[PDB]
Every structure is written in structure tokens, then in C-alpha cells.
Amino acid sequence: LSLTNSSLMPTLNPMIQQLALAIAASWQSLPLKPYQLPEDLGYVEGRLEGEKLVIENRCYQTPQFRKMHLELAKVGKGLDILHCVMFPEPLYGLPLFGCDIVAGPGGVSAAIADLSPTQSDRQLPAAYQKSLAELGQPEFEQQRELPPWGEIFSEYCLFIRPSNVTEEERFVQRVVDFLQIHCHQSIVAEPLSEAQTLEHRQGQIHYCQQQQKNDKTRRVLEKAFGEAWAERYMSQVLFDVIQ
Ligand SMILES: C=CC1=C(C)C(=O)N/C1=C\C1=NC(=C\c2[nH]c(/C=C3\NC(=O)C(CC)=C3C)c(C)c2CCC(=O)O)/C(CCC(=O)O)=C1C
């Protein structure tokens, strides 16, 4: 899991660095095993007519989390990206943890984090609603409205442009807080009925299908690797539909 030997880390936006370290710290002592991505993917680079895209992939699994994926990326010199999803094992009915950070020379442009529902009623489990409410409403000066496919995210979803360092740190700490809640709930979660497992499975499939509608990600991938490679990456590596 260690980020100390990452070639990208030293060159990424500081907020992305802190988030990557936080996520790695949350996962480090779990009962991890490797999760083999398609073609045993780790590092990948590509270029067509413009800038090069470089991606480093780390991916694990535990009994509660089917797939725990941390991706770090850079387009050319200046655009940095962090992607992370923890895909739950439907048996336990846990929500989906996700975060996405995009940064350029002007600073972080997008910071998104959520614990996303998998229940058919589109609500988080009661224990999560309670814990998340207790954190209080965070103040951020530059909130961004989610795109329509973003109906999958919970009412606790953050989507901002950080205005300053105070806000960058407040966002990172809130993701820490999400992870702490999530890891704890994973150990207390009652395993579920076959019908309930099916319900949660469908929520996760819908989440992936909706995430694949993000043309921001797709355009970045297509400009470095082309349409076919991007469709494979989005549907097989990033947001794989379990089935
Ligand atoms: C948990 C949520 C979540 C996960 C897990 C996730 O992967 N994305 C997620 C969310 C989400 N991301 C968004 C934006 C962008 N994403 C990238 C690119 C990548 N993001 C990547 O992960 C990778 C592979 C490394 C690339 C290449 C770019 C360039 C932007 C534009 C940045 C900006 O406008 O300032 C938006 C706003 C969408 C919109 O405005 O229409 C939302 C909602």
C-alpha cells in the first residue's frame, strides 16, 4: 500500500498528497489482500496528439470491501487527479465511499467526497445517518452543483472548489471522518438476507452505470488513449458492473 515508493506522489498537488496518505493510513492495518485489476494493471501511460496521461493504480479487497481502488494520475505537467472508491461487499449492505480530486496550476478545481447509498430507498443506513449528522454542516465558500448523473450521491456529498488552505484542510479532515465512520461501521455491520443482498448489489450496479456517464473523466482518458481504451477503462477498471 505504501506511497513512499510512488513516482507520482512527490509531484502531486499537496491536498492530493494528504488525501492519498489519509486513505492509505485508513486501509493499512485492515485485513487486505490484493485485488487484481484487468490485465494485472499497475502503472500506465499514454499519449496521442497532446499531453501524456500517467496513472498509478493500487487495489485491494477485504471481506467487507469487494474492491478498494486508489488511483493517482497526472496529465502533462500540471493536471493532477486522485480517484478512490471502496466498493462494498453487498452481503454487508455498506455504502460506497468515493472521492475525486482534480487540481491544476491554479490549485484544486474540484474536490468531491461521499458515502453513497446502495439501498433502494436511496438512503444511507441509519447508523451512518446518525454519525454523519453529528459531524455538523461544513462551511465551504465555493460549492458546486452535481451533474444530473450525480443523483447517486448522498445528501452528505461534498463537491467544492476549495477557496484556500483552511478549506483544503477542512475537506481532507471531513474525508478522514467519513473513513473513520465507514471502517467502524464495517466491523459492526450485520450480514444481510439474500433479498437485501440483491437490493444492495443493484444499488452498486446503478452507481457504476451512472459514474460511467461522467464525460469529464472520459474526455481526459480519450485524449491520451482514445475512445475504445477509455470505454474499456471506465467500464472494466474504474466502475466495473458486478454481475
Ligand atoms: C465520488 C465521486 C467520483 C469518483 C469516484 C470519480 O472518479 N469521479 C467522481 C466525481 C466527479 N468528478 C468530477 C470531475 C472531473 N473528473 C475529472 C477527471 C478524472 N477523475 C478521475 O477519477 C479520473 C481517473 C483518474 C479522471 C481522468 C476531471 C478532469 C473533472 C473536471 C474537474 C473540474 O470541473 O474542475 C465531477 C464533476 C463533473 C462535472 O462537472 O460534470 C464529479 C461529480
Side-chain angles (χ1 to χ4, degrees), residues 1-138 140-243:
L1 219 196
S2 189
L3 293 171
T4 56
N5 297 136
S6 166
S7 285
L8 283 186
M9 273 288 290
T11 75
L12 300 175
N13 182 97
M15 194 193 176
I16 286 174
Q17 293 179 323
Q18 292 290 350
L19 279 159
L21 190 80
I23 290 162
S26 178
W27 298 354
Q28 172 268 329
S29 292
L30 293 183
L32 302 178
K33 262 83 202 323
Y35 184 102
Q36 311 300 153
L37 289 171
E39 298 179 354
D40 289 86
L41 185 62
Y43 185 83
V44 62
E45 311 182 346
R47 189 199 297 267
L48 288 168
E49 299 297 341
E51 298 294 324
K52 195 159 72 161
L53 172 60
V54 175
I55 303 165
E56 284 180 10
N57 284 287
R58 292 165 173 83
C59 203
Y60 316 88
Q61 58 183 305
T62 75
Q64 293 77 29
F65 307 118
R66 169 189 79 79
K67 174 179 168 181
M68 303 153 60
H69 190 192
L70 175 66
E71 184 161 294
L72 302 175
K74 191 181 275 278
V75 181
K77 278 228 171 54
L79 188 65
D80 299 344
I81 298 156
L82 182 147
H83 163 94
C84 178
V85 183
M86 300 169 71
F87 296 92
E89 194 64 43
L91 183 75
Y92 297 100
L94 301 173
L96 294 122
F97 169 85
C99 62
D100 211 52
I101 310 290
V102 178
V108 178
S109 65
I112 300 102
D114 195 36
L115 289 158
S116 307
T118 52
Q119 294 174 3
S120 64
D121 67 359
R122 301 171 65 255
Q123 306 300 298
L124 292 167
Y128 281 81
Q129 294 189 215
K130 196 173 208 184
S131 290
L132 288 164
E134 288 167 24
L135 296 176
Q137 186 136 52
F140 292 109
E141 295 181 1
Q142 304 187 85
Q143 301 221 309
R144 298 181 62 176
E145 184 183 31
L146 291 159
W149 62 263
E151 57 87 8
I152 63 180
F153 299 121
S154 88
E155 64 276 4
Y156 291 99
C157 186
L158 309 173
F159 178 20
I160 69 172
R161 174 185 181 95
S163 296
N164 49 49
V165 164
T166 297
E167 290 196 349
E168 290 180 11
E169 295 179 346
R170 178 174 307 142
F171 178 95
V172 173
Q173 181 57 236
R174 193 37 55 81
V175 172
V176 169
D177 295 335
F178 287 1
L179 290 166
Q180 281 175 356
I181 289 160
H182 197 41
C183 287
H184 182 76
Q185 292 303 316
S186 76
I187 61 179
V188 303
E190 286 275 5
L192 302 178
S193 83
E194 282 175 59
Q196 291 168 320
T197 300
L198 187 51
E199 176 187 339
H200 289 287
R201 188 181 303 123
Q202 173 50 219
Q204 180 175 163
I205 291 171
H206 180 71
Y207 180 92
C208 286
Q209 288 172 337
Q210 294 292 93
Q211 287 273 27
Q212 285 176 222
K213 295 180 178 172
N214 191 351
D215 285 352
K216 301 301 184 299
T217 298
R218 192 177 296 269
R219 187 174 184 267
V220 166
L221 301 181
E222 293 187 328
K223 291 303 173 188
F225 289 97
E227 292 85 351
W229 183 108
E231 167 61 23
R232 177 173 175 286
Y233 199 81
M234 288 180 83
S235 66
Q236 299 182 32
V237 177
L238 294 178
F239 298 110
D240 59 309
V241 163
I242 56 185
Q243 217 80 308

